[PDB]
Design a protein around this nucleic acid. Structure first.
Ligand SMILES: [Zn+2]
Ligand SMILES: [Zn+2]
Ligand SMILES: [Zn+2]
Ligand SMILES: [Zn+2]
Ligand SMILES: [Zn+2]
Ligand SMILES: [Zn+2]
Lengths: 86, 87, 153, 176, 377, 176, 150, 86, 88, 377
RNA sequence: UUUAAAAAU
RNA sequence: AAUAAAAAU
């Protein structure tokens, strides 16, 4: 019930299939393993965090918390989002 | 419900769990992935070993500590707090 | 569109109201005395020439009840809206047909005359859905899904 | 006979918020072209004894009506919340009420400029991004990570005075 | 700054111009004067406060004045003061409520307010607040009035950097003053004292000492095939005796009425009936103008009711017929109409109506005379 | 040949205080008649390389001269106090410097209206007193009980903007 | 009269005391530059030099007599002299304060750029100055405006 | 070296000769005892306070203290001042 | 120096004294008027009897406590009645 | 309300009137634009800031701009920014010093300030602050310039609520611009670039391409029968090429100089000597204008040191003769004068002066020619 | 003529 | 034409 993601640096995450369904690329791909050529470990963690947040508040329309971002990581986070169409 | 992140041996897992759930249920949840008995597994928080009998409330952690954008970070051990990558 | 309406009614939290038992209070003439407050409440309810206000404690939502003559013209009402006290000893029942975010809904409530407070709940409407204009319904349904992000060229 | 009644969800605000809304709408309608085409009906152009002002935003073939009310029944004892606001959506003879958040969402779909389609690839290439989104009220929803990252990289313009958003108009500072 | 000893001519002329509907006058100037209770003496204090109308409630000229006045009040604890305001804009709603609170707290100050324009005079909440602050005679008495030529000239004399010279009123000072007085009377729901009504409403054929014409008016609206009153629109007004600074030519009460009818922004798509009660019948010019106005505006109906028929030089018969051809019904008050006017337009203090001798006979005589006048042409 | 010098006492002040002094003096000279008769000589009307202005106050036969100075190195390291003030009292060729407080006292002896000789008589009669001392800085010394009692009985007028006073001009801020 | 005034009144915010004084020219420039410019100003006599009391606001300014021009011969003529001491410079300045003629005498240590200053009564020029002007000033400083009006 | 003052209400004060010398009436009158027909005891206390105040600060012209007064006492204090020619 | 007020039996004395002056010097000062030996007389502050040997510093009172416009208040006794002032 | 996206036409026409001496312009309007290094592209941000001159220092538009910029700069540390100010009044002394400090802390901000008028340009302390902010190259460059037709038009196009109307220059725009340009050149102590001096100042008998007159000046004052220099009065200026937007007939350097002299406020009771060094002799019209100016201003003596004789149609000889007769002393530049000009009015960077070929011979020949012209009549 | 009013500053 | 500038608001 979990999809395994391998960071380009050689780290491992696992995220529920429903969470990964939000990403078009992973949804099309899903085999139970995925390898990301360019996404670093921290960017994979951040996109997993985005999945977590969106799933938590996908349907709620009241008092949506903030999603912290940092300028230094924003560029590659946007690159990863584009690649994943998230 | 609160989200949690468990990291060990450069392996990471993300999950959601109830507030009142005890550490035994946490070990049960991670068992379905790591396929080992809950008994030997021991958790860690702030590099402090968590005994077999533990609960969230007793630990002092609250729903505010664990958030979708800021889950509680707890290590794991079997019978190393690896930092995340950098730019 | 009826199955989609039902699915959204059941699953999507659309307003501050959560489609559950919500306590409400009568807001009219608060600074006036309690006896005067309920006397005017009953007099307006019987006469029907004044507007009646109810506020939910936990939110800013209000139900403001306007006489139908104030609006410019009479509107066709396939359903019936009513506000009466006779059904109970001292309880007034309120029925309010509405259209919330494109889904037709019935807001039901009761108020105790003695304490000038009560409760309200929200229920799906099935009969009127077919009556409503399917053109406007589908156009609204399409419109409430589109996103301005990257929409244009 | 039994009385015929009409019911409406009347948001509740203080008078100062309504006056600020009116001022902002007028300014952005006449002095600035950002709200051109909006219609502002004065208090004497409605027979309703309680309507204070109607603002009509033509959403293409449809319409969105924001109505302020005077002397409402709330009669708050402090008087701090004696007036009110309401939002409605019209198309020919259809009529429905809308959320304040959904109201601005539907507003931003037409009028205020937002990030164009090419803004994703511009960030990839590093090319200057333009035009930028100036109406954050139109994206209160949980947007895609692409949009959020783009917004973080390049911050929105903060026009002065602020553009009119129903969300700001209809909120409860008293209880919060 | 906020306080100033006086103000320049330019700002005075730009801000105190009293057109009922002005934009761009976003500042409020409050020229205040304080005097000791009773006999006339030079003011113990007088200055000017400034404030934007959009600034926070604490920075408004009235709130600033009272904040200063509270501390100024703890030097002579046992003295009672009179305070006079000359303010370009009428106090806001919040300022009105807070002034009512402060004046109730301390019953040892008299407050008189003179206002150039009426800020948001069409707001129901503002009307309620003004009634609370000023209407009560038992409660806090805070008088409010419109500024006329005299008030503006005094403000020029004592609150302007006018190098010694004369005040030149702008174009339409009296017209604007009468419009604002009528509007304010409607808002505060003024009413005639019994003596004036008694001495002016009598139907005796022969009278003496009544050369000023009174009038009362009330609007009504078609809805559901029924007449529905508008408690908003009710009031009485008289004619202006010619004066140098006012209309050089005497302004008739009917003419003021006609000038004010447009202001109510009566909707064209609807139908209204305006019921007017007059002690004297309209004169020739007044009837001509009334008929012209009625003809031009086809969405309004008139209902005139006269107490004493006025026929001085015979010109009135032509005017009555022009009114009739216009479409304005004309009649004479019977006992019922007299009592209705007494109970609707007088501060009777709950007292009953006291008809005078030979009311019915004289009323029937007047009805016969009017019928004879109208049937024949 | 030994060098010659002129020696003056220069109370160091900051720019804003001198600016305000100039503004108040001009206002009360032109806008109001209270300071009518004062002469204000500009910066270009004096050959002195350092002078910045001069205020001449005719005290009967004698005269009082308040001077301000530019570009002195005397000012503090922070350079807050780059400017300075000085007061002289000249009669034909004779001259003598004056203390700021004594300068204010001398000023009050001529120009601003003060309590009349009948002020006390009217005070003990309970009737009105016209006019009243509008200049408090001119009575820096502790005076007769008559003045303290009468002033306690009736508050002095507060002119707006404040009347110009040397004591306020030369007051020491930081080194209190 | 003048002597009694000087001894009694402690007039003019200065009490004829040995007070700390310091040179303040060019506080921003470094110590050596300050000393060099102070020495040059003292010798050449074409610039201005200021001596400030440490804990107060008063300061004594020396401007070249040329700037104000219109020279007036002064008895006990002011001087800034370095001849008396190798390491110190002496300052003497006649003045008239609040109707009494005085001398200000001080000294500055060129190494520390500070020192002491004091005030001393002057007996000579007091009788030389015009009797009329001093009498008029004495009258003026005695009166009070209160209740003076008619 | 001390002059005696008698309060009309039945109270006694004493103040040095020099302090009283500031007052014209007492200066001309002064016998080593003074009786005042109208001045209450509190007013006598206030006037003695004024005497000491001015004797302390008659000469100093630097950082003079404020001399407290209250409006309710003002009229009687003024009457006492005018009587004493202070 | 400070200024002081001493009240006893509706008799009051106004005088100045040095800061360090001990109570013995105060008794000497009041001796010239009361014609009584210093030893038996006892002072009072806030209804607290003062020992024969007392000094300002030990007492804690300072020049700030006593002003010409508000001198230190002290009672006195012979061998206590804090009489307040009259009223309007 | 402090920030505005645009200002109204009355505001622009009232606050940006560039007369060197204006009162009642108590507000400082600061339009600004922020750009990045690289190809020209639309500004990242562009708005307006407001504030009285007498308000607290923290509210002046310059401090507000820098407070906003500090936070707005967090996003991109690596980025290097260009700032352009269009300010009605030039910054104050305290603001000038704090701006110097701010730019000193951040070496990645290049600031240009376009001023309509110069504020307190006669204050020595302000002059020192301006020199520290601008003249000193060790501190980060903060360029300052006066606004011309181009800058006013750019503002009117981008910082005003214009409805596609066209910019309408006021009466004396170019005159005031040139006065302010000369004053700012005086205050900032600009110097001639060596190439311009070498090309324009050669005294060779025949030359080609030089159609512009350069005029350096310096004033001196009588004191104790001695000439004391006014270091504040020292600078140079060139002629204005004819332009449709500026002067239709471009002004000669002499006319600009004579227009500036009245703004030095030279004292009437003293005596001044004004020495001018030129590359060309005055023309006929310039000669008459200078002669009239000298005749009317008896407290000014004029000395001219020319490099070459400008003769055309024979009127130049008459012009020189009348100029000499009016009282002015005319002579020719020799080696000493050339070296003095080089060391005074040129940015020599410590380098020495290199006399050109035939300098002495040409100087002697021109001296003989001038003697003949001035003696023959 | 017009301003329904922070439509500006 | 004049404003040396908080002489204004
Ligand atoms: Zn957008
Ligand atoms: Zn107000
Ligand atoms: Zn008439
Ligand atoms: Zn006085
Ligand atoms: Zn500034
Ligand atoms: Zn020429």
């Amino acid at each position: 019930m979990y999809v395994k993601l391998i960071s380009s640096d050689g780290h491992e995450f696992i995220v529920k299939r429903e969470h990964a369904l939000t990403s078009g690329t992973i949804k099309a791909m899903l085999t139970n393993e995925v390898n990301f050529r360019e996404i670093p470990s921290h960017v994979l963690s951040k996109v997993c965090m985005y999945f977590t947040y969106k799933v938590r508040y996908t349907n709620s329309s009241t008092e949506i918390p903030e999603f912290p971002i940092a300028p230094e990581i924003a560029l590659e986070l946007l690159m990863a989002a584009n690649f994943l169409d998230c | 419900d609160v989200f949690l992140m468990i990291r060990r041996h450069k392996t990471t897992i993300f999950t959601d769990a109830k507030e009142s759930s005890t550490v035994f249920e946490l070990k049960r949840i991670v068992e379905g992935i790591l396929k080992r008995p809950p008994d030997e597994q021991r958790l860690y928080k702030d590099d402090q070993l968590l005994d077999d009998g533990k609960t969230l409330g007793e630990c002092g952690f609250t729903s505010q500590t664990a958030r979708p954008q800021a889950p509680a970070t707890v290590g794991l051990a079997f019978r190393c707090i690896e930092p995340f990558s950098s730019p | 569109v009826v199955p989609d309406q039902r699915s959204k009614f059941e699953n999507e939290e659309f307003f501050r109201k959560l489609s559950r038992e919500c306590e409400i209070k009568y807001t009219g003439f608060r600074d006036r005395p309690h006896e005067e407050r309920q006397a005017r409440f009953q007099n307006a309810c019987r006469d029907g020439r004044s507007e009646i206000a109810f506020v939910a404690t936990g939110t800013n939502l209000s139900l403001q009840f306007f006489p139908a003559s104030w609006q410019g013209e009479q509107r066709q009402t396939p359903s019936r809206e009513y506000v009466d006290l006779e059904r109970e000893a001292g309880k007034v029942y309120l029925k309010a047909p509405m259209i919330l975010n494109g889904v037709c809904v019935i807001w039901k409530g009761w108020i105790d005359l003695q304490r000038l407070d009560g409760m309200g709940c929200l229920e799906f409407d099935e009969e009127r859905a077919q009556q409503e204009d399917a053109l406007a319904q589908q156009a609204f349904e399409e419109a409430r899904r589109r996103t301005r992000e990257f929409e244009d060229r | 006979m039994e009385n015929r009644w009409q019911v409406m969800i009347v948001w509740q605000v203080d008078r100062m918020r309504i006056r600020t809304w009116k001022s902002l709408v007028k300014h952005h309608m006449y002095v600035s072209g950002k709200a051109r085409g909006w219609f502002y009906r004065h208090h004497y152009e409605s027979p309703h004894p309680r309507i204070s002002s109607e603002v009509h935003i033509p959403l293409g073939d449809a319409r969105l009506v924001i109505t302020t009310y005077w002397g409402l029944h709330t009669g708050e004892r402090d008087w701090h919340l004696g007036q009110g606001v309401s939002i409605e959506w019209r198309k020919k003879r259809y009529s429905t009420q809308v959320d304040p958040e959904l109201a601005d969402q539907l507003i931003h779909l037409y009028y205020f400029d937002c990030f164009s389609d090419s803004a994703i690839r511009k960030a990839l290439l590093g090319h200057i991004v333009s035009p930028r989104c100036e109406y954050q009220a139109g994206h209160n929803k949980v947007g895609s990570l692409q949009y959020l990252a783009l917004a973080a990289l390049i911050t929105p313009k903060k026009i002065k005075p602020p553009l009119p958003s129903v969300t700001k108009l209809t909120e409860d500072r008293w209880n919060k | 700054r906020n306080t100033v000893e006086r103000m320049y001519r330019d700002t005075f002329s730009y801000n105190f111009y009293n057109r009922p509907i002005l934009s761009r006058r976003n500042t409020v100037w409050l020229c205040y004067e304080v005097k000791t209770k009773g006999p006339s003496r030079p003011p113990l204090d007088a200055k000017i406060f400034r404030g934007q109308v959009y600034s926070e409630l604490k920075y408004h000229p009235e709130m600033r004045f009272f904040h200063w006045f509270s501390k100024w009040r703890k030097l002579h604890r046992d003295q009672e003061y009179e305070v006079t305001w000359y303010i370009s804009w009428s106090p806001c709603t919040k300022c009105t409520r807070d002034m009512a609170t402060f004046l109730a707290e301390d019953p040892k100050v008299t407050l008189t307010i003179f206002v150039a324009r009426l800020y948001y005079f069409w707001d129901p909440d503002y009307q309620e607040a003004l009634r609370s602050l000023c209407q009560k005679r038992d409660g806090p008495r805070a008088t409010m009035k419109i500024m006329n030529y005299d008030e503006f000239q005094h403000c020029w004399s004592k609150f302007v950097y006018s190098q010694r010279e004369l005040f030149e009123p702008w174009n339409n000072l009296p017209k604007y003053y009468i419009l604002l007085h009528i509007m304010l009377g409607e808002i505060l729901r003024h009413s005639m004292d019994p003596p004036t009504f008694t001495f002016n409403f009598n139907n005796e054929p022969w009278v003496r000492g009544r050369h000023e014409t009174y009038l009362c008016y009330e609007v009504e609206r078609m809805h559901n095939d029924t007449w529905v009153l508008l408690n908003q629109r009710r009031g009485f007004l008289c004619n202006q005796a010619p004066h140098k600074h006012g209309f050089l030519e005497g302004r008739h009460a009917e003419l003021c009425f006609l000038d004010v009818i447009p202001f109510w922004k009566l909707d064209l798509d609807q139908d209204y009936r305006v019921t007017c009660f007059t002690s004297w019948s309209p004169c020739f010019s007044c009837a001509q103008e009334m008929a012209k106005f009625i003809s031009k505006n086809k969405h309004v109906s008139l209902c005139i009711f006269t107490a004493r028929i006025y026929d001085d030089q015979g010109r009135c018969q032509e005017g009555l017929r022009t009114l009739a051809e216009a479409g304005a019904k004309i009649s004479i008050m019977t006992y019922s109409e007299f009592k209705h006017c007494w109970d609707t337009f007088v501060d009777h203090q709950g007292c009953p109506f006291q008809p005078w001798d030979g009311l019915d006979e004289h009323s029937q005589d007047l009805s016969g005379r009017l019928r004879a006048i109208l049937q024949n042409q």
